Amino acid sequence: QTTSHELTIPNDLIGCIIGRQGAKINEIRQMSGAQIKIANPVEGSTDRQVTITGSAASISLAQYLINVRLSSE
DNA sequence: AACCCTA
Ligand SMILES: Nc1ccnc(=O)[nH]1
Fold this sequence. Notes:
The chain is α+β, with helices and mostly antiparallel strands. The chain has one domain: 2-Layer Sandwich (Ribosomal Protein S8, Chain: A, domain 1), CATH 3.30.1370.10. The chain contains three helices and three strands. Strands 1-3-2 form a three-stranded antiparallel beta sheet. Helix 2 runs antiparallel to helix 3. The longest helix has 15 residues. 19% of the residues are buried. The protein binds 6-aminopyrimidin-2(1H)-one. 6-aminopyrimidin-2(1H)-one binds next to loops. It binds one DNA strand through helix 1, helix 2 and strand 2. This is Poly(rC)-binding protein 2. It is found in: Nucleus; Cytoplasm.
């Protein structure tokens, strides 16, 4: 199985997901095995597009890990 | 109050 899930995260919350030097998001990539793409900043947008791609288990785990981070902030 | 990776 290989599909993509799309979400949108406000600009002020994406730093918590990424972490300093991208350490947090890199960890989420490594643990989940999912391909994760956070869009470049868009000056006329309040949020960032995030795409999670991979197996059903990988996408689910990536989403779980993202929610853990969001639930702190 | 807001970490900037991968690609
Ligand atoms: N208020 C919100 C917090 C986290 N994620 C959202 O999409 N919205």
